[PDB]
Amino acid sequence: ARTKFTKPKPKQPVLPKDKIRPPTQLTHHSNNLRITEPIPPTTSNLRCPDDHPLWQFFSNKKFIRSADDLPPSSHIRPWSIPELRHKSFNDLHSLWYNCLREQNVLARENHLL
């Protein structure tokens, strides 16, 4: 513990002026540096393509199809099994993938809703 009797410690052993090495780095940062306001990134530099494949998840580039934009229930019908039965394999496969695409579009929208 520190006490009335504690004599102060000696100063650290400095290396002489002649013996000390010169530092490897001499010239440091500029003193003139100034805190400028930030520069927020802009959409102007982008060139988002009109046929970017992620537009395929939308429908007519709409954030959401309105009631009028949607196909009405009376006009639309699902496929009949008999109708499907006389379609080729490749055609059926294409139809399936179109269906899946449509679901994805709706799923995105449905989730948002």
Binding site: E37, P40, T42, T43
Partner: protein, 112 residues
């Protein structure tokens, strides 16, 4: 330490309401405010007039809001891209509806 009996209706009521100490008193010491002719307490400032003066002071002695240049001159689309919206929590929503839990000062009656 413990009550020996169910205290009766009479004895609890005469205890509570019988003494004048325990009763509420009429506030006889109301009087007219000179700035607006309304009720106020005696030897007290009118809370309307002092509030108005405080409001005036605020409007005049107003520290200007810091609007950063770069955010003030953003495009709308660019701003939307950078700083999109979010769902606030239930707690946050509750905090936002201040009128639910925060009492604004009522005006007194006009003196005759």
């Amino acid at each position: 330490a413990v009550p020996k009996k169910k205290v009766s209706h009479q004895k609890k009521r005469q205890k509570l309401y019988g003494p004048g100490k325990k009763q509420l008193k009429m506030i006889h010491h109301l009087n007219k405010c000179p700035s607006c002719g309304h009720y106020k307490r005696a030897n007290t400032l009118c809370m309307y007039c002092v509030g108005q003066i405080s409001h005036i002071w605020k409007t005049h002695t107003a520290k200007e809001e810091i609007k950063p240049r770069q955010e003030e001159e953003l495009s709308e689309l660019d701003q939307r891209v950078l700083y999109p919206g979010r769902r606030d929590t239930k707690y946050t929503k509750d905090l936002k509806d201040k009128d639910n839990y925060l009492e604004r000062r009522v005006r007194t009656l006009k003196k005759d």
